[PDB]
Design a protein around this ligand. Structure first.
Ligand SMILES: N[C@@H](Cc1ccccc1)C(=O)O
Ligand SMILES: N[C@@H](Cc1ccccc1)C(=O)O
Ligand SMILES: [Fe+2]
Ligand SMILES: [Fe+2]
Ligand code: NI
Ligand code: NI
Ligand code: NI
Ligand code: NI
Ligand code: NI
Lengths: 232, 235
């Protein structure tokens, strides 16, 4: 029953890995500065992901064994937003602008799915028992590993070329997201009702992640001049 | 409606407490420059556009045949347009400053504006499994707090608008009037609540006002930390 949930996540990962946005980001015949055109889009997400971890996943009030594991893991995942801001500046995307241009960017209709991903995960998660929150987190982190494996390609290109330490679109981020881990609790037996719910979770997490990546792809096409401007 | 009657009475009681908060004492104090009273204005950024999104994507359900949801949808069309008024007045007040992208992000996601940022998030979570009649209690409670907030803010706003001969749209009487408001949701006091609905509605009104008071506390503390600073309207 868990076996099947864990296999559905690997199926969803395999279709997710194939999305056009990822073939573009991986395409070494395109400059990495051009492939990281979508980097600013992450603003509408990276900081919501911090809040999801601090406020929605974490429950310091709880005494349940599984929620304590979750509480521990959310502790680390809530720190990566500063890495996003680090690489924003390294990539020359930390541009001076009117406050209103920053707000109109975050709340753009073209970044609706990006901005609402974490909100959707919080709504999905708020009435789940902790083992079912661990399915949300495990599926989400699978979509996450796919996204950051791809972005760390042009990221590490720029990092080595410019000799600056990238922290977000970087192997160190992909490595510490992976490196008791939650998947290790594939020694859990799902009731019939939990299996039906775990199907809803894994499907929604991958559909919402697909919608975000579609928005990233549309942004690149709408902004093909606005390549990253790193400095040696 | 004696159950419904209690709910409407609880909202008035919460409004009476809410109107008396220190933030609104400050905002209403004509012995202080309206420029210093609106120094909290930029804090609304973390709320105004989230409110638009709550109306567009959470409150609204275009496909519903439900009598109550069709009335909600009509009200959401209008109330989701006010964020442009927010950005209009942001510029007029001199608060649409040049800054790095990251300075804007760190502001919006400030730990000092957590309750401001998450008010609409909390309403969407509260609203997720509500039948349309109960979504109306959420909207009426919320709007009761909004009308208190904007009635207060419109006082220094209209002061600046008159003196600078500029049209303010957000911290302005026009906003309060159009927001107050075919049928108004409160006119749906021709509805009776089951005992269980009545319990849920009490929970709704208590949380809406708790979350609204949390936002106002953050504004009050922001003001305290920015008293030397003020709005810079141009004539
Ligand atoms: N690893 C991301 C979070 C994330 C998880 C899953 C999917 C996408 C993003 C971060 O630090 O911001
Ligand atoms: N009237 C506010 C929204 C709001 C509603 C309810 C309470 C508080 C604020 C706006 O236009 O942004
Ligand atoms: Fe991360
Ligand atoms: Fe409004
Ligand atoms: Ni972990
Ligand atoms: Ni719920
Ligand atoms: Ni653009
Ligand atoms: Ni209305
Ligand atoms: Ni300040």
């Amino acid at each position: 029953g868990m076996k099947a949930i864990l296999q559905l996540i690997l199926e969803k990962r395999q279709e997710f890995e194939k999305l056009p946005c990822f073939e573009f980001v991986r395409d070494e015949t395109i400059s990495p500065e051009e492939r990281l055109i979508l980097y600013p889009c992450i603003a509408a997400f990276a900081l919501n992901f911090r809040d999801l971890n601090r406020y929605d996943y974490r429950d310091d009030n709880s005494s349940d064994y599984y929620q304590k594991i979750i509480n521990i893991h959310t502790q680390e995942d809530a720190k990566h937003w500063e890495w996003f801001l680090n690489d924003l500046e390294l990539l020359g995307f930390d541009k001076t602008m009117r406050f209103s241009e920053a707000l109109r960017f975050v709340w753009s209709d073209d970044l609706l799915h990006t901005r609402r991903l974490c909100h959707n995960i919080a709504v999905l998660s708020h009435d789940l028992e902790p083992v079912m929150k661990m399915v949300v987190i495990e599926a989400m982190e699978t979509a996450g590993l796919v996204i950051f494996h791809a972005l760390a390609k042009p990221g590490e290109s720029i990092a080595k070329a410019t000799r600056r330490k990238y922290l977000y679109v970087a192997d160190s981020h992909v490595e510490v997201e992976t490196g008791n881990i939650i998947t290790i609790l594939e020694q859990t037996q799902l009731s019939s009702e939990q299996e039906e719910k775990a199907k809803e979770i894994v499907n929604k997490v991958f559909q919402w992640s697909t919608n975000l990546i579609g928005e990233f792809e549309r942004y690149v096409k709408a902004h093909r001049s606005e390549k990253a401007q790193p400095t040696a």
